[PDB]
Coordinates of C-alpha atoms and ligand atoms in Angstrom, one line a residue:
Chain W
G1 CA 104.9 161.7 187.9
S2 CA 101.9 161.0 185.2
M3 CA 104.5 163.1 183.1
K4 CA 103.1 161.6 179.4
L5 CA 104.4 162.2 175.6
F6 CA 101.6 160.7 173.0
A7 CA 102.7 159.7 169.9
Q8 CA 101.2 157.6 166.6
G9 CA 97.6 157.5 169.0
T10 CA 100.0 155.5 172.1
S11 CA 101.8 156.9 175.4
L12 CA 104.7 157.0 176.7
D13 CA 104.2 156.8 181.0
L14 CA 107.4 158.6 182.4
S15 CA 106.4 158.4 185.4
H16 CA 109.2 156.2 185.1
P17 CA 113.1 156.1 183.4
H18 CA 113.2 154.6 180.2
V19 CA 116.3 153.0 178.0
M20 CA 116.3 154.0 174.5
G21 CA 118.6 151.0 173.2
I22 CA 120.7 152.6 170.0
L23 CA 120.3 151.2 166.7
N24 CA 122.9 152.6 164.1
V25 CA 121.8 151.6 160.6
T26 CA 124.8 152.9 159.1
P27 CA 126.3 150.2 158.1
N28 CA 119.3 140.9 154.9
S29 CA 121.4 144.0 157.0
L30 CA 117.5 145.1 157.3
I31 CA 116.9 141.4 158.6
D32 CA 119.9 142.3 161.2
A33 CA 118.9 145.8 161.8
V34 CA 115.3 144.2 163.2
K35 CA 116.9 141.3 164.9
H36 CA 119.4 144.0 166.8
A37 CA 115.8 145.7 167.7
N38 CA 114.5 142.4 168.9
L39 CA 117.6 141.5 171.2
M40 CA 117.3 145.4 173.1
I41 CA 113.5 145.3 173.8
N42 CA 114.4 141.5 175.6
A43 CA 117.0 142.9 177.4
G44 CA 114.4 145.2 178.4
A45 CA 114.7 148.0 176.1
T46 CA 111.2 150.8 175.1
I47 CA 112.3 152.8 173.0
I48 CA 114.5 151.9 170.0
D49 CA 116.3 155.3 168.3
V50 CA 117.3 154.4 164.8
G51 CA 119.6 156.6 162.8
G52 CA 121.2 156.3 159.0
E53 CA 123.8 159.2 158.8
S54 CA 127.2 158.5 161.5
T55 CA 127.8 160.9 163.8
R56 CA 131.8 159.9 164.9
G57 CA 134.5 163.0 160.1
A58 CA 131.9 160.1 159.4
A59 CA 130.7 160.5 155.6
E60 CA 127.4 163.7 155.5
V61 CA 124.6 160.9 153.2
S62 CA 122.1 162.6 151.1
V63 CA 118.1 162.7 151.6
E64 CA 118.2 159.8 149.3
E65 CA 120.1 157.3 151.2
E66 CA 118.9 158.6 154.7
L67 CA 115.8 157.7 154.0
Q68 CA 116.8 153.7 151.8
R69 CA 118.7 153.4 154.8
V70 CA 116.3 154.8 157.7
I71 CA 112.9 154.3 156.9
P72 CA 112.5 150.7 155.9
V73 CA 113.9 149.6 159.2
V74 CA 111.0 152.6 161.4
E75 CA 108.8 150.6 159.0
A76 CA 109.9 146.9 160.0
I77 CA 109.7 148.1 164.0
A78 CA 106.6 150.0 163.8
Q79 CA 105.3 146.0 161.7
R80 CA 107.1 144.0 164.4
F81 CA 106.6 145.7 167.4
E82 CA 104.8 147.5 170.6
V83 CA 107.7 149.7 171.0
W84 CA 108.7 153.2 170.7
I85 CA 110.5 154.3 168.2
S86 CA 113.0 157.8 167.8
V87 CA 114.6 158.9 164.8
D88 CA 117.7 160.0 164.6
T89 CA 117.5 163.3 161.6
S90 CA 118.2 166.7 160.5
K91 CA 116.6 166.3 157.7
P92 CA 112.9 167.7 156.6
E93 CA 111.9 164.8 153.9
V94 CA 113.4 162.2 156.6
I95 CA 111.5 163.9 158.9
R96 CA 108.4 163.7 157.2
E97 CA 108.4 160.1 156.1
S98 CA 109.4 158.5 159.5
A99 CA 106.4 160.3 160.9
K100 CA 104.3 158.4 157.9
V101 CA 105.7 154.7 158.4
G102 CA 105.1 155.2 162.4
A103 CA 107.9 156.9 164.2
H104 CA 107.0 158.7 167.9
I105 CA 109.9 160.7 168.2
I106 CA 112.2 163.0 166.3
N107 CA 115.9 163.4 167.4
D108 CA 117.8 165.9 166.5
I109 CA 120.7 166.4 167.4
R110 CA 120.8 169.7 165.6
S111 CA 117.6 170.6 167.1
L112 CA 116.2 171.4 163.5
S113 CA 117.9 173.8 162.2
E114 CA 118.2 172.7 158.9
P115 CA 116.0 174.4 156.6
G116 CA 112.9 173.4 156.7
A117 CA 113.1 171.1 159.1
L118 CA 111.8 172.6 162.0
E119 CA 107.9 173.6 159.7
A120 CA 108.6 169.7 159.2
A121 CA 108.7 168.4 162.7
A122 CA 105.6 170.8 163.0
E123 CA 103.3 168.9 160.7
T124 CA 103.8 165.5 162.2
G125 CA 103.0 166.5 165.1
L126 CA 105.7 164.4 166.6
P127 CA 107.8 164.5 170.5
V128 CA 110.8 166.6 169.3
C129 CA 113.9 166.2 171.4
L130 CA 116.5 169.4 171.0
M131 CA 119.6 169.0 172.2
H132 CA 122.3 171.7 173.2
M133 CA 125.2 171.1 171.0
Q134 CA 129.0 173.1 171.3
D135 CA 128.6 179.1 183.3
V136 CA 127.8 175.7 181.0
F137 CA 124.6 175.6 183.2
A138 CA 123.2 178.8 182.0
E139 CA 124.4 178.7 178.6
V140 CA 122.6 175.4 178.0
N141 CA 119.6 176.8 180.2
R142 CA 119.3 179.5 178.0
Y143 CA 119.5 177.7 174.9
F144 CA 116.7 175.9 176.5
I145 CA 114.6 178.9 176.9
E146 CA 115.3 179.8 173.5
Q147 CA 114.2 176.5 171.2
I148 CA 111.6 176.1 173.4
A149 CA 110.1 179.4 172.3
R150 CA 111.6 179.1 169.2
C151 CA 109.3 175.7 168.7
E152 CA 106.4 177.5 170.3
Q153 CA 106.4 180.1 167.3
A154 CA 106.3 177.6 164.4
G155 CA 103.1 176.0 165.9
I156 CA 104.7 173.1 167.9
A157 CA 103.4 172.1 171.9
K158 CA 105.1 172.9 174.5
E159 CA 104.1 169.3 175.3
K160 CA 105.4 168.0 172.5
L161 CA 109.6 168.5 173.3
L162 CA 112.1 166.6 175.0
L163 CA 115.5 168.2 176.3
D164 CA 118.7 167.0 176.1
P165 CA 121.6 168.9 177.6
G166 CA 123.4 167.4 174.6
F167 CA 126.5 165.2 176.6
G168 CA 130.0 165.8 174.9
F169 CA 129.6 167.7 171.5
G170 CA 132.0 170.3 172.0
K171 CA 132.0 169.8 175.8
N172 CA 135.2 169.0 178.1
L173 CA 135.3 166.8 180.8
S174 CA 135.2 169.4 183.6
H175 CA 131.7 170.9 181.3
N176 CA 130.0 167.5 181.2
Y177 CA 130.2 166.8 185.2
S178 CA 128.6 170.1 185.5
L179 CA 125.8 169.3 184.0
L180 CA 125.2 166.4 184.4
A181 CA 126.0 167.5 188.7
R182 CA 122.6 169.9 187.7
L183 CA 121.2 168.0 185.4
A184 CA 117.6 168.1 187.7
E185 CA 117.5 171.7 187.9
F186 CA 116.7 171.5 184.7
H187 CA 113.8 170.1 185.4
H188 CA 111.8 174.0 186.4
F189 CA 110.7 173.6 182.7
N190 CA 108.3 170.7 183.5
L191 CA 109.7 169.4 180.4
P192 CA 110.7 164.9 179.9
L193 CA 114.8 165.1 180.3
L194 CA 116.8 162.9 177.7
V195 CA 120.3 161.7 178.4
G196 CA 122.7 160.2 176.0
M197 CA 126.7 159.3 178.4
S198 CA 127.2 156.4 176.9
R199 CA 130.6 154.8 175.7
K200 CA 131.7 159.5 175.7
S201 CA 134.6 160.6 176.1
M202 CA 133.5 162.2 179.3
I203 CA 134.2 158.9 180.2
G204 CA 136.8 157.4 178.4
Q205 CA 139.2 160.6 178.7
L206 CA 138.6 160.5 183.4
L207 CA 139.6 156.6 183.1
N208 CA 141.6 157.0 180.4
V209 CA 140.2 153.9 178.7
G210 CA 138.7 152.8 175.5
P211 CA 135.1 153.0 173.7
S212 CA 135.0 149.1 174.5
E213 CA 135.8 150.0 178.8
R214 CA 133.6 152.2 179.3
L215 CA 130.2 150.1 180.6
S216 CA 131.3 150.1 184.6
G217 CA 131.5 154.4 183.5
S218 CA 128.4 154.2 180.9
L219 CA 126.7 152.8 184.1
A220 CA 127.3 155.6 186.9
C221 CA 126.7 158.5 184.4
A222 CA 123.2 156.9 184.2
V223 CA 122.9 156.2 187.4
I224 CA 123.8 159.6 188.4
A225 CA 120.9 161.0 185.9
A226 CA 117.9 158.8 186.5
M227 CA 118.1 159.1 190.4
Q228 CA 117.6 162.8 189.5
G229 CA 114.9 161.9 187.4
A230 CA 116.4 161.9 183.9
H231 CA 113.4 160.1 181.7
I232 CA 114.9 158.9 179.1
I233 CA 118.5 157.3 178.5
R234 CA 120.5 156.3 175.3
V235 CA 122.8 153.4 175.4
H236 CA 124.2 151.0 173.6
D237 CA 124.2 148.6 176.8
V238 CA 120.5 147.5 176.9
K239 CA 120.2 145.0 179.4
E240 CA 122.8 146.1 181.8
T241 CA 121.5 149.6 181.4
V242 CA 117.7 148.3 182.4
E243 CA 119.0 146.3 185.4
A244 CA 120.6 149.6 187.0
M245 CA 117.6 151.3 186.2
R246 CA 115.4 148.9 187.8
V247 CA 117.7 149.5 191.5
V248 CA 117.1 153.3 191.0
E249 CA 113.4 152.9 190.4
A250 CA 113.5 150.2 193.4
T251 CA 115.5 153.4 195.5
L252 CA 113.1 156.5 193.9
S253 CA 109.9 153.8 194.9
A254 CA 110.9 153.5 198.6
Chain E
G1 CA 140.0 167.2 202.9
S2 CA 138.4 167.0 205.9
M3 CA 136.2 163.6 207.8
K4 CA 139.6 160.9 208.2
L5 CA 140.8 158.5 211.0
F6 CA 144.1 157.0 212.6
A7 CA 145.7 154.5 212.6
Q8 CA 148.9 151.9 212.3
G9 CA 150.9 155.9 212.0
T10 CA 148.7 156.4 208.7
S11 CA 145.6 158.2 207.7
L12 CA 142.5 157.9 206.1
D13 CA 141.1 160.6 203.9
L14 CA 137.4 160.6 204.0
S15 CA 136.5 163.7 201.5
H16 CA 136.4 161.3 198.4
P17 CA 135.4 156.9 198.7
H18 CA 137.1 154.9 199.1
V19 CA 136.8 151.3 197.5
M20 CA 137.2 148.1 200.5
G21 CA 137.7 145.3 198.3
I22 CA 136.7 141.7 200.0
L23 CA 139.2 138.8 201.1
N24 CA 137.3 136.1 202.0
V25 CA 139.8 133.4 203.8
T26 CA 137.5 131.5 205.3
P27 CA 137.3 127.7 204.6
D28 CA 134.8 128.3 201.9
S29 CA 137.5 129.8 199.9
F30 CA 141.3 127.8 200.8
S31 CA 142.7 125.5 203.3
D32 CA 144.1 126.2 206.3
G33 CA 148.0 123.6 207.1
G34 CA 147.4 122.0 203.5
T35 CA 148.9 121.9 200.7
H36 CA 147.8 124.4 198.9
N37 CA 149.5 127.9 199.0
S38 CA 146.9 129.7 200.6
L39 CA 148.9 132.1 202.2
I40 CA 150.4 133.4 198.6
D41 CA 147.3 133.1 197.0
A42 CA 145.1 135.5 199.6
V43 CA 148.0 137.4 199.2
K44 CA 147.8 137.7 195.0
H45 CA 144.1 138.7 195.2
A46 CA 144.6 141.2 197.5
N47 CA 147.5 142.8 195.2
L48 CA 145.0 142.3 192.6
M49 CA 142.6 144.1 193.8
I50 CA 145.4 147.0 194.9
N51 CA 145.8 147.1 191.4
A52 CA 142.4 147.8 190.7
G53 CA 142.1 150.6 192.7
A54 CA 140.6 149.4 195.9
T55 CA 142.2 151.7 199.0
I56 CA 140.8 149.0 202.3
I57 CA 140.9 145.2 201.8
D58 CA 138.8 143.1 204.5
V59 CA 140.3 140.4 205.5
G60 CA 137.6 137.3 207.0
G61 CA 138.7 134.3 208.5
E62 CA 135.4 132.8 209.8
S63 CA 132.4 132.2 207.4
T64 CA 128.7 133.1 208.4
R65 CA 127.2 131.2 204.9
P66 CA 124.1 129.7 206.2
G67 CA 125.8 126.0 206.8
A68 CA 129.0 126.9 207.6
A69 CA 130.6 125.4 210.9
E70 CA 132.5 127.6 212.9
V71 CA 135.8 128.2 213.3
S72 CA 138.5 127.5 216.6
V73 CA 140.3 131.0 217.7
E74 CA 143.6 129.1 216.6
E75 CA 142.4 128.8 213.2
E76 CA 140.5 132.2 212.5
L77 CA 144.3 133.3 213.8
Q78 CA 146.2 131.0 211.8
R79 CA 144.2 132.4 208.7
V80 CA 143.5 136.0 209.5
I81 CA 147.2 137.1 211.3
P82 CA 149.5 136.1 208.5
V83 CA 146.9 138.1 205.4
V84 CA 147.1 141.1 207.7
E85 CA 150.7 140.8 208.4
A86 CA 151.7 140.4 204.7
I87 CA 149.8 143.2 203.4
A88 CA 150.5 145.5 206.3
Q89 CA 154.0 144.7 205.1
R90 CA 154.1 145.3 201.2
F91 CA 151.3 147.8 200.0
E92 CA 150.2 150.9 200.9
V93 CA 146.2 150.1 201.8
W94 CA 144.4 149.8 205.0
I95 CA 143.5 146.5 206.3
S96 CA 139.9 145.8 207.9
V97 CA 138.9 142.5 209.7
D98 CA 135.9 140.8 210.3
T99 CA 135.7 139.0 213.4
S100 CA 133.9 138.5 216.3
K101 CA 136.8 137.3 218.6
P102 CA 138.5 139.2 221.3
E103 CA 141.7 137.1 220.9
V104 CA 141.2 137.8 216.7
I105 CA 140.7 141.7 217.7
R106 CA 143.7 142.0 220.0
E107 CA 146.3 139.8 217.3
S108 CA 145.3 141.6 214.1
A109 CA 146.2 145.6 215.6
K110 CA 149.7 143.8 216.6
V111 CA 150.4 142.9 213.0
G112 CA 148.9 146.0 211.9
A113 CA 145.0 145.6 210.9
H114 CA 143.5 149.3 211.2
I115 CA 139.8 148.5 211.7
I116 CA 137.6 146.4 213.1
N117 CA 134.7 145.3 211.4
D118 CA 132.8 142.8 213.3
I119 CA 129.2 141.8 211.5
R120 CA 127.8 141.3 215.8
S121 CA 129.0 145.1 216.8
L122 CA 131.7 143.8 219.5
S123 CA 128.6 141.8 221.2
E124 CA 130.8 138.8 222.4
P125 CA 132.4 138.8 225.7
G126 CA 135.5 140.7 226.2
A127 CA 135.4 142.0 222.3
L128 CA 134.3 145.6 223.3
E129 CA 137.2 145.5 225.6
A130 CA 139.5 144.0 223.2
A131 CA 138.7 146.6 220.7
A132 CA 138.9 149.6 223.1
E133 CA 142.5 148.4 223.9
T134 CA 143.6 148.3 220.8
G135 CA 142.7 151.7 220.5
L136 CA 141.6 151.0 216.2
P137 CA 138.5 152.0 215.0
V138 CA 135.5 150.0 214.8
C139 CA 133.0 149.7 212.3
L140 CA 128.7 149.3 213.9
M141 CA 126.7 147.6 211.9
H142 CA 122.6 147.3 212.3
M143 CA 122.0 143.2 211.9
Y144 CA 109.6 146.6 211.4
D145 CA 107.4 149.2 212.3
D146 CA 109.8 151.3 210.8
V147 CA 113.7 150.6 209.8
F148 CA 114.9 153.5 209.3
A149 CA 113.8 154.3 213.0
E150 CA 115.1 151.2 214.0
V151 CA 118.4 150.6 212.5
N152 CA 118.9 155.1 213.4
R153 CA 117.9 154.2 217.5
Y154 CA 120.5 151.1 216.5
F155 CA 123.1 153.4 216.1
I156 CA 122.7 155.5 219.0
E157 CA 123.1 153.2 221.3
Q158 CA 126.1 151.2 219.9
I159 CA 127.7 154.8 219.9
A160 CA 126.6 154.9 222.9
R161 CA 128.2 151.7 224.6
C162 CA 131.5 152.5 222.5
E163 CA 132.3 155.3 224.6
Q164 CA 131.0 154.2 227.7
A165 CA 133.7 152.0 227.0
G166 CA 136.3 154.9 226.6
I167 CA 136.2 155.0 223.0
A168 CA 136.6 157.3 221.1
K169 CA 134.1 158.7 218.4
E170 CA 136.1 159.6 216.3
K171 CA 137.1 155.9 216.0
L172 CA 133.5 154.8 215.0
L173 CA 132.1 154.2 211.3
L174 CA 128.5 153.2 211.0
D175 CA 126.9 150.5 208.2
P176 CA 123.3 149.5 207.7
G177 CA 124.1 146.3 207.4
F178 CA 122.5 145.6 203.8
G179 CA 120.5 141.9 203.6
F180 CA 120.9 141.3 207.2
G181 CA 117.6 140.5 208.6
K182 CA 116.3 143.1 205.7
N183 CA 114.0 141.8 203.1
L184 CA 113.8 143.9 199.7
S185 CA 111.5 146.5 201.1
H186 CA 113.7 147.6 204.3
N187 CA 117.1 147.3 202.3
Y188 CA 115.5 149.9 199.6
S189 CA 114.4 152.6 202.0
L190 CA 117.4 152.3 203.6
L191 CA 119.4 152.6 201.0
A192 CA 117.1 155.7 199.6
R193 CA 117.8 157.7 202.9
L194 CA 120.8 156.7 203.1
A195 CA 122.1 160.4 204.0
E196 CA 119.7 160.5 206.7
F197 CA 122.7 159.4 208.6
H198 CA 124.7 161.6 208.1
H199 CA 122.9 163.6 211.2
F200 CA 126.0 161.5 213.3
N201 CA 129.0 162.9 211.3
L202 CA 130.7 159.7 211.2
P203 CA 131.6 157.3 208.9
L204 CA 129.3 155.5 206.6
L205 CA 130.1 151.9 205.4
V206 CA 127.8 150.2 203.5
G207 CA 127.8 146.5 201.3
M208 CA 125.2 145.5 198.8
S209 CA 128.0 143.8 196.8
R210 CA 126.7 141.0 194.5
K211 CA 123.5 140.2 197.5
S212 CA 120.0 139.3 197.3
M213 CA 118.4 142.5 197.1
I214 CA 119.8 143.3 194.3
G215 CA 119.8 139.2 192.8
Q216 CA 116.2 138.5 193.6
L217 CA 114.6 142.3 192.0
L218 CA 116.8 141.4 189.0
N219 CA 116.4 137.6 188.8
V220 CA 119.9 137.0 188.2
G221 CA 122.7 134.7 190.0
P222 CA 125.4 135.6 191.8
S223 CA 128.2 136.1 188.8
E224 CA 125.5 138.6 186.9
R225 CA 125.0 140.8 189.7
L226 CA 127.6 143.6 188.3
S227 CA 125.7 145.7 186.7
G228 CA 122.8 146.2 190.5
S229 CA 125.9 145.8 192.6
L230 CA 127.3 149.0 190.6
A231 CA 124.3 150.9 190.7
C232 CA 123.8 150.2 194.5
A233 CA 127.6 151.5 195.4
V234 CA 126.7 154.6 192.7
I235 CA 123.3 155.4 194.7
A236 CA 125.2 155.2 198.2
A237 CA 128.3 157.1 197.1
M238 CA 126.4 160.1 195.4
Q239 CA 124.4 160.2 199.0
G240 CA 128.3 160.4 200.2
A241 CA 128.6 157.1 201.8
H242 CA 132.6 156.8 202.5
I243 CA 133.2 153.1 202.0
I244 CA 131.8 151.2 199.7
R245 CA 132.3 147.5 200.2
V246 CA 132.6 145.5 197.3
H247 CA 133.8 142.1 195.0
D248 CA 134.4 143.4 191.7
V249 CA 137.2 146.4 192.7
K250 CA 137.8 147.9 189.4
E251 CA 134.4 148.9 187.8
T252 CA 133.4 149.6 191.5
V253 CA 136.3 152.0 191.2
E254 CA 135.6 153.2 187.8
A255 CA 132.1 154.0 189.1
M256 CA 133.3 155.9 191.8
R257 CA 135.3 158.3 190.1
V258 CA 132.2 159.3 187.8
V259 CA 130.8 159.7 191.4
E260 CA 133.7 162.1 192.2
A261 CA 134.4 164.0 189.2
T262 CA 129.9 164.9 189.6
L263 CA 130.7 165.8 193.1
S264 CA 133.6 167.9 192.8
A265 CA 131.0 169.5 190.4
Ligands
LIG301 C1 120.7 160.6 168.2 N1 122.2 161.4 168.8 N2 123.7 160.6 168.6 C2 124.5 160.6 169.5 C3 125.7 159.8 168.8 N3 126.6 159.9 169.3 C4 127.3 161.5 168.3 N4 126.8 161.8 167.5 N5 127.6 162.8 167.5 N6 128.6 163.4 168.0 N7 128.3 161.9 168.6 C5 124.7 161.3 171.0 O1 125.4 161.2 172.0 C6 122.9 161.5 171.1 C7 122.7 162.4 172.6 O2 123.3 162.5 173.0 N8 121.2 162.9 172.5 C8 120.5 163.0 171.9 N9 119.0 163.2 172.4 N10 120.3 161.7 170.7 C9 121.8 162.0 170.2
LIG302 C1 132.6 141.5 207.3 N1 131.2 141.9 206.4 N2 130.8 140.5 205.8 C2 129.6 140.6 205.3 C3 129.4 139.2 204.7 N3 128.2 139.2 203.9 C4 127.7 138.7 204.8 N4 127.6 137.7 206.3 N5 127.1 137.6 206.8 N6 126.1 137.2 206.0 N7 126.1 137.9 205.1 C5 128.8 141.6 204.7 O1 128.0 142.0 204.3 C6 129.3 142.6 205.5 C7 128.3 144.1 205.6 O2 127.4 144.4 204.6 N8 129.0 145.4 206.3 C8 130.2 145.0 206.9 N9 130.3 146.5 207.6 N10 130.9 143.6 206.4 C9 130.6 143.1 206.4

């Protein structure tokens, strides 16, 4: 409520939930990527998440490959749209170059653990998402305390930080649901909360359904998180999620 | 695991949410006594909903679409009773009946219905007495200076009305009546404050599926309301609503399982 992020001279208003559309650029191709961004923006996404290294035992990519895949897409979106852009990268060089071409958020699932990443993040002055990876609530909470301190000591202001409990990523079904159930408790940090549950195995394993059959469970997870005041919901299916968020917003507004 | 209803020799365990599938057997859906096999049609639909995980099937034979002509007692009996009977014979689900008529209430009970779900809360002549005589669970549905306070007060008065007629409190369900003389603001206030209705310690039943409170908010037509419906169902269920009345059972059941896994933790 009046919580805000600032980047690239603009601001993101976190008094309501935002839907972050996933834009996978691990598979002309530039134009495809931009058209996909266009669909997600038209569906109501207010942040577009660009990732160029796959996270499925998928192949690692070099610095050079990630630069070649990610940077042109970030740049083309900054030139076409007034939308926030997040980049999924662990690599110092990608962090620095993303900021130069107009990215708003560094979204590192490794929370800046690669050598030089922390320094690169601090130098950009960008918002940074910290994700917990592989009492679960106490473990994740402790992890947040440690990463905030780690970032503060590197010169990164607390107001630049976003927190993500890391659904999936070395977590069993019980552990995923405990985190979901207690998500609101993470507000004690007074930081933005970002969650990614879309199509995850915490739904697949619960319902015994494959990746393409997880829409309803995804929507349920998003609504549960948003009703607990999560700020950013990272999803594959933007339109459906945005419609769900409008129902949440009408409820919370009342 | 705690709160329960009893009817027809079985019990409904309300320690977790139940999905109630809508089965419309009114003139808007099917002929009665015509060439079409409406009975088999109705039962196949019930079967799909049960296979999708519905644990209650809501059967209604009188239309309540704005234009719709009222049906005779005989026609309503002919539409509803065969369907109630067929489900009570075949499937291990509860059956709710949507009727305001004393005769349909009495006959439904005889052939195996578990819940009387009257949107008129038994206000028709004879309905209250017929409901009491059956011994069945009864749903009370509301149909402003303050909408929450008006619905709350309505509940207090109808519970007392039912009690005075010999219906035990342990047979009662409460439904705030989404879309029932209610604009967008009113619908969302009731949804936001749903948990406050637990003070009565009674089952909460809600029906938002495909309603205008979604359609008008999102500017989507009746066949495109699934996401908004799911969101409503989840918001209600996270607030401990007991029964969710829906058209799209499979998706709702999936959503409830996510809720149950969350609440359990
Ligand atoms: C950038 N990113 N990517 C994924 C992709 N799914 C995955 N990757 N590795 N294993 N599964 C993701 O899930 C998330 C998440 O959950 N949170 C946050 N902040 N960023 C994520
Ligand atoms: C039996 N029934 N039927 C409807 C159909 N929708 C409607 N009827 N009239 N105007 N709109 C309904 O919405 C509900 C509801 O919401 N709750 C409960 N307990 N029973 C309902």
